[PDB]
Each structure stands twice: as structure tokens, then as C-alpha cells.
Amino acid sequence: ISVEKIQKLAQSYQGDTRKRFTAWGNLIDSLKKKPVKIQLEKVNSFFNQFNYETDPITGASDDYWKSPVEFIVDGGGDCEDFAIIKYFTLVAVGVPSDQLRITYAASLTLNQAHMVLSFYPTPESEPLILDSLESKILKASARPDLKPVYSFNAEGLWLAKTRGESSLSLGKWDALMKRME
Ligand SMILES: [Ca+2]
């Protein structure tokens, strides 16, 4: 997306919302051309300042992927929603989309399903985990509390243990894209 788009978007709001729009946009403009490690840490940290919404029913995620704009307006979301805006923010600052996957994992600690953002330095690499419930950005192997089940992005779906090529984009991803237009 564009930081000029967000500038536009910021005008159509006020209060603790238009400045979250400008804070968000400044960030993207700030992180352009910056080292990946800086980008990952600052984006992760920026959004982990947002509100963590727990679904009053499931006690976790609901069934609705919030668009980033919605995440900004609502001032937050659940673990899937966190992974989503981090994904798009990082793509905006120039991280190649194919280095980023939204990951559905079994959590041993929370004893339930938990979504994270996985960043892959190189294609064969074990990913770094950008969690909404952990400030540390750690390698997969340093997150034994997490056992991935599947991952996805704009380019496919990977069943855990799938190396390289997509296991197949989800229809649910498509619908989110359409919602973001
Ligand atoms: Ca959600």
C-alpha cells in the first residue's frame, strides 16, 4: 500500500484515530530502505502496542480476518488480526511478500490454536516468529511452545513440513483482499 494513501486516509478521520493513521504512515516512510532486522523489530513492537482483543466466545480468535485499516480504526484485534497488519506493514516497507507467511500453530503454553507471522530470511531458512504474545523475535526452534500446522500468504498454503512449493491462495485470503480495496 502507499504512505500517500494513508495520508489520504488520515484526513478522513480525527481524534485517537487520525493520528494512529499518521503514526502508521510515518512508520512505513521511516522504515523504507532500512535493514530487515530493524524493520521486523520496529513493526512488531509498533503493533504489539495495540489492543489485544479476545473473542468472548472462543476465548481466542474469531472467524473474521480484520483488514489493516480496520485494525487501525478499531485500535486492535486478535492474534490472527495482529499477524495480518504486521504482514501488510512489512510488505509496504519493502520486505518481499514471499518471505512472509501467516502461520497457524498449536500452542502448548496457551493450550489452544495461535496465529503468528513467520519471516523467512532465505527460502530454506527456519523462520523468525513475530508473535503478538511474545516481544522476543525468535527462531522456530527457539519456539518449542509452537507447533505449526499450516501457513499461508498471497501466494499459497503450506501444510506444516511442506518445504518449498505451495501445498495447493485460500478463498478467505481473496475475500480479505477484496475487502481491502
Ligand atoms: Ca480476527
Query: From the CA of 33, how far away is ligand 1's center (Å)?
Result: 31
d(CA 100, CA 117): 7
Q: What's the full length of the chain, in residues?
A: 181
Three-state SS for 114? strand
DSSP 99: G
What is the whole-number distance in angstroms between the Cα of residue 61 and the centre of ligand 1?
5
What resolution in angstrom units was achieved for this structure?
1.9
Domains of the chain: 1-181 (3.10.620.30)
Strands (E) across 83-145 are located at 100-107, 112-119, 128-130, 138-139
Question: 114 C-alpha vs ligand 1 centroid, how far in Å?
Answer: 11
Q: For residue 50, how far is its CA from the centre of ligand 1 (angstroms)?
A: 14
- Solving technique for this entry? X-ray
Residues in binding site: 62, 64, 78, 80-81
Q: Give the residue from 112, 144, 117, 146 showing the smallest Cα distance to 131.
A: 117
Three-class DSSP category at 161: coil
Contacts of 140 (CB under 8 A, 6+ apart): 118, 126, 127, 128, 129, 146, 148
Strands 146-153 and 76-77: unpaired
